[PDB]
Write a protein that binds this ligand. Structure first.
Ligand SMILES: [Mg+2]
Ligand SMILES: [Mg+2]
Ligand SMILES: [Mg+2]
Ligand SMILES: [Mg+2]
Ligand SMILES: [Mg+2]
Ligand SMILES: [Mg+2]
Ligand SMILES: [Mg+2]
Ligand SMILES: [Mg+2]
Ligand SMILES: [Mg+2]
Ligand SMILES: [Mg+2]
Ligand SMILES: [Mg+2]
Ligand SMILES: [Mg+2]
Ligand SMILES: [Mg+2]
Ligand SMILES: [Mg+2]
Ligand SMILES: [Mg+2]
Ligand SMILES: [Mg+2]
Ligand SMILES: [Mg+2]
Ligand SMILES: [Mg+2]
Lengths: 129, 88, 218
RNA sequence: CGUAAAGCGCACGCAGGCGGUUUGUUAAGUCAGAUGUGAAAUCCCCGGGCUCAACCUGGGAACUGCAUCUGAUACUGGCAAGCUUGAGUCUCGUAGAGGGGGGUAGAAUUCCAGGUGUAGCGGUGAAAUGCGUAGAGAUCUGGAGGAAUACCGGUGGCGAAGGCGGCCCCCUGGACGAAGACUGACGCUCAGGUGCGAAAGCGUGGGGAGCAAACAGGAUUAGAUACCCUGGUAGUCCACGCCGUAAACGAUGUCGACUUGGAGGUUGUGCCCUUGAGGCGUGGCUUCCGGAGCUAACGCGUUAAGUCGACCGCCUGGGGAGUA
């Protein structure tokens, strides 16, 4: 059931991508957005778009560089069944540094490079590379 | 499974008006209606095991709905079960 | 823009999902390809095609079917170009080194047709040895001499030529090919939409390819 | 955890876990900093002392922890009030071996009665046992009774599973579709618990045509406690109540979202000179084939065994043992 949307996002992406699908949409939310943000701002998607009002609709434009998709792997990490939280010193780094980890902090949803520089930590929503 | 006349009658006896059809109280009451009706179908027969399944489904549906109301508006809950005559 | 009078598209169901981007069809139980997206594929098509033909064109107009074999042993055959118009003896690229002597037997025989031994031995051996040569001739004509190693490859019907194309992909050979709606692209580097087993789209583009190798740098 | 160990036979559901979307607030989880504390030894790093080393020793580092204070508010939790797509309710219809009860029909078998008719019938590989001169079998007519419903009939349909096929009425469950209207997260899952659950089997009473464990006879065979034959009891049928198991199998737990295609079957519904027995769409279910992908392979493949998440069940070498 709907129960975990954020994985559903991570997934609708993962999938469409593997389906060399141009765009991809889904029910939106404060949260979906903030991540679609980091995802664009870190250059894993072209650009997002939320087209509705009562029943908002996040829409992401996918990217493809060579022939490949740009997003080579996108996984949940925290989840309803099992929440993950890391302190600053204990934040994770994906692919040695390449690619990134989305972490939500008391100062908003930012990357790991980010939250690290911000000197704090929070819930590690997902990994991406 | 209950009449249009009958089901209507009760919407009109429990909701704001005919149309306020999905009002908690209403659902409960037109459920409660069919359950009781049925008591006699299963009085005779009794081996109608299959149909029995549907009836329980009615009871547990109603049960969950009753549970909802109570949490929401306790005031409305109590009135209901009195007026519907259950929860001994 | 268009030039293909009546090759429009072709091929009914049997359509290959991956061939959607070049389809605008839907006429009476059959796709018309996207005419207006084929021609931008003469651009690039005959371009890197020629861009090498002046760097020196070695080709292989590979295309078979007792229904267009001869129409390939043509000005397709004639120019800076080799060809195959019969059963693609599998491994003829990937095993050229074995096959290279299936050549020696062709020559060392016809070179000896109106020469060498010939009207001699028995009049059994006679046409009972020209059957050796006849057989060889088709499927191993166009090969004759391969002077400059097979360099690009131009194929009529992508999938019908499973093997040919495959070998290329394996040996790093450009493969220019036209792909009907039904066929699987991506085996083909330079892809050309539109019909691939009708007497026109052949000759047309076929003949038109002969026209760009046969002239690049005088 | 399809076929190797492993999905409970099926469902409903308490506790529990998890839970769409918006704004406010809370600050428990979470995060930040500060302070105290985290015995020494030990470990580790750099040294120093015993001829070296083990050994001894200086000083750091480390003790990933705990608590207090103050902060941060994205996520989670709490409180509040909403929201409409999740989930329900309502309206008219549609298909159906879905369930329960009662009624009823023709075809056959067995039996009873009678006409005609006469020496065999029946059965096997071949036989014999058996049946017939008290007239069999064969045929015809009338009658009794039980059991099951040919054709339709179909990788057809319904049900949670078990499983449900003549026809008719009554009672009744679920599913699906088309419009909009109402509720407003009322949801998902579910250890425990409760219900249902083929056949055989048990209890009391019926009922008994055919079939048939047991048992008897006849054969076959080296033997024949069998396979075959002639018989035939429980049982197979009804009511009431037990039992609770099956290769209860898709050997594939339930719910949700996402991801190229192709040819059927079945069932709703919108549009098109209905002007064709149709034309183009749009749901539910179903069979075959097949792409990525997955797989030890076989295979699966939008009805997943692909890609993800929520909860539950279960596996941890064979035998011993699903035994004590
Ligand atoms: Mg097993
Ligand atoms: Mg099961
Ligand atoms: Mg949310
Ligand atoms: Mg210490
Ligand atoms: Mg020393
Ligand atoms: Mg909150
Ligand atoms: Mg009779
Ligand atoms: Mg009779
Ligand atoms: Mg019904
Ligand atoms: Mg039971
Ligand atoms: Mg029984
Ligand atoms: Mg009995
Ligand atoms: Mg017997
Ligand atoms: Mg068992
Ligand atoms: Mg398949
Ligand atoms: Mg399909
Ligand atoms: Mg799955
Ligand atoms: Mg036991």
């Amino acid at each position: 059931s709907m129960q975990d949307p954020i994985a559903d996002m991570l997934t609708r992406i993962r999938n469409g991508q593997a389906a060399n699908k141009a765009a991809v949409t889904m029910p939106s939310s404060k949260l979906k957005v903030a991540i679609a943000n980091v995802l664009k701002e870190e250059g894993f998607i072209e650009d997002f778009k939320v087209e509705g009002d009562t029943k908002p609709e996040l829409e992401l434009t996918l990217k493809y560089f060579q022939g490949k998709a740009v997003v080579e792997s996108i996984q949940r990490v925290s989840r309803p069944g099992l929440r993950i939280y890391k302190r600053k010193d204990e934040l994770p780094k994906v692919m040695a540094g390449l690619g990134i980890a989305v972490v939500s902090t008391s100062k908003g949803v930012m990357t790991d490079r980010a939250a690290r520089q911000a000197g704090l930590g929070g819930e590690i929503i997902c990994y991406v590379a | 499974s209950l009449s249009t006349e009958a089901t209507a009658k009760i919407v009109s006896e429990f909701g704001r008006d005919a149309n306020d059809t999905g009002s908690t109280e209403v659902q409960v009451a037109l459920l409660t209606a069919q359950i009781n009706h049925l008591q006699g179908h299963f009085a005779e027969h009794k081996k109608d095991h299959h149909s029995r399944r549907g009836l329980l489904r009615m009871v547990s549906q109603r049960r969950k709905l009753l549970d909802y109301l109570k949490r929401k508006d306790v005031a409305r809950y109590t009135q209901l079960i009195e007026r519907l005559g259950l929860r001994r | 823009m268009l030039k293909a009078g009546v090759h429009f598209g072709h091929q009914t169901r049997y359509w290959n999902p991956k061939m959607k981007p070049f389809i605008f069809g839907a006429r009476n139980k059959v796709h018309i390809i996207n005419l207006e997206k084929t021609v931008p594929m003469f651009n690039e098509a005959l371009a890197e095609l020629n861009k090498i033909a002046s760097r020196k064109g070695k080709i292989l107009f590979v295309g078979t079917k007792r229904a267009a074999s001869e129409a390939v042993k043509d000005a397709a055959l004639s120019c800076d170009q080799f060809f195959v118009n019969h059963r693609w003896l599998g491994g003829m690229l990937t095993n050229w080194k074995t096959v290279r002597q299936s050549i020696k037997r062709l020559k060392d025989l016809e070179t000896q047709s109106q020469d060498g031994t010939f009207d001699k031995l028995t009049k059994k051996e006679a046409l009972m040895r020209t059957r050796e040569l006849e057989k060889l001739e088709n499927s191993l004509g166009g090969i004759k001499d391969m002077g400059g190693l097979p360099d690009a490859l131009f194929v009529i019907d992508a999938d019908h030529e499973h093997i040919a194309i495959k070998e290329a992909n394996n040996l790093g050979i450009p493969v220019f090919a036209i792909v009907d709606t039904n066929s699987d692209p991506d085996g083909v580097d330079f892809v050309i939409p539109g019909n691939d087993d009708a007497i026109r789209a052949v000759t047309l583009y076929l003949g038109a390819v002969a026209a760009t190798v046969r002239e690049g740098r005088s």
